[PDB]
Structure formats: C-alpha cells, structure tokens
Amino acid sequence: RSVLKNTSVIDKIESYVKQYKPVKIDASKQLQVIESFEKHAMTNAKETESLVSKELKD
Amino acid sequence: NVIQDLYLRELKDTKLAPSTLQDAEGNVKPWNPPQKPNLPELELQGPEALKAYTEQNVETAH
C-alpha cells in the first residue's frame, strides 16, 4: 500500500477482502451418508467375521 | 549561474503536472468479488448403494 501512490483503491480492495473475509463457510456433509454406509458395512463385516471364526473352530 | 537559472526557472514554473486517478483506472485491473462459494454436493446417501454393491459384484472373494 505504501508502494502505491494512488492509494485509496488499496484501501478499497482491503475493505473488499475484509468484507468478503468469509470466502466460503463450513462443509460437513459426511454425517448423513457416512452413518448409512457404516450400518451396512458393519453388518457385513461382522457376518463375515463370525462365519469364518465359526469355520476356524470347525 | 546557469545552474541557478535553470534550477530556478524549472522549479518555479512547473510544480503541477496532470494527475487524474480516473485515467489510471482504465490502465489497471478491476477488483470484483469471488463467485460460487458452493457447498459440496451430497451423494451416495443410504445403504441403498451398499446393498446394491454387495450384490452387484459377484466376486466378493475368490
């Protein structure tokens, strides 16, 4: 800003940056899809685990 | 002598020059704000995809 001699447009873009200081807000979207996926995955994981464990002792 | 004459003449007779900020604007890039702060799209909701996937690939282990 001290480089520019036309400064009153550096004050403008400073205020534009500080205005638009939120440049995009938070994204958490893995909280609906992750749980659904986890239920089916857990079910299948446990089923396989139990089946083969049973077979091991068999 | 002549140094003084020129020095005097120049300094005194010119000390304003043109300077319009508006003309400057034409020659520089304009500040405009970012676009599309778009939140991510949510996809593959439900175990619908998973049930489909378990079934879909016949080879689940071979």
**Alpha-carbon gap, residue B3 to B11, rounded angstroms:** 12
Q: Between A9, A19, A40, which is nearest B47 by CB? A: A40
Question: Is the Cβ pair A16, B31 closer than 8 Å?
Answer: yes
With b for 16 or more beta-carbon neighbours within 10 A and e for fewer, the B13-40 pattern comes to eeeeeeeeeeeeeeeeeeeeeeeeeeee
Question: Is the Cβ pair A33, B21 closer than 8 Å?
Answer: no
In a mutational test of the A interface, the residue from B45, B48, B56 whose CB has the highest number of chain A CBs within 10 Å is: B45
Provide the resolution (angstroms).
4.4
Residue from A6, A32, A45, A58 nearest B43 by CA? A32
